[PDB]
Amino acid sequence: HISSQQHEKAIKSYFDEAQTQGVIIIKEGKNLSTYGNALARANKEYVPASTFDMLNALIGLENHKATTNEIFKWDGKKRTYPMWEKDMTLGEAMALSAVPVYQELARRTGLELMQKEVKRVNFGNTNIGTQVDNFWLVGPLKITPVQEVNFADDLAHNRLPFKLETQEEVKKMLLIKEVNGSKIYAKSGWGMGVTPQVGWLTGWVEQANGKKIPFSLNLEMKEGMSGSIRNEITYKSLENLGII
């Protein structure tokens, strides 16, 4: 019905109007489409930031460093975001993007096991360096938007090298919206200790019929933008292409 010229124009506009630069890669079956107002970002490397939480969770549960019911006690230190100053499960930590909890998990896994697991899964550039607790925030781990949607495709279809149980455990943590009768599973990332800042929203749509449509939005965050513009742009784009 609508031409691809209009889809492309509309999706470019969503990025234009938020005063950023970025892309969203969508995958339908085995076919990858690139949209936004900066198409050349697609194969450039950025730190994954809290998008890593997904894999971190996978590794931790697979290797029995945590339980889905386990309560990570707040240590009582002042937290940069007060929504973090509480006890939570990996699940609650996923929604809140509670880095302290994910750092605990990283420490439990340990640098050695972390390095092996990330080679094994072949995630991004696969280098995690020497600091087990911040590699996903400031480097040297980097990944492309194309890689991210492929990782999201793997996970949506349970193709990652981990028990099915582990995958389902981690996926249940990822539900962020129900729209129309479709479900949006995804994780945000905001890389604040890199210059310029990067923003991510990776996951998939599970439609009523059962098909799964993976996506990765990636754009530059600039000082004093709201994090939800990542969501908003993603939603409009999925809706423009009638994926929701």
Ligand SMILES: C[C@@H](O)[C@H]1C(=O)N2C(C(=O)O)=C(S[C@@H]3CN[C@H](C(N)=O)C3)[C@H](C)[C@H]12
């Ligand atoms: C919407 C917004 O308030 C909140 C949110 O969501 N964000 C995310 C996210 O999507 O990864 C983070 S992560 C954190 C920021 N500083 C840490 C760092 N060294 O980069 C990592 C914020 C808490 C920001």
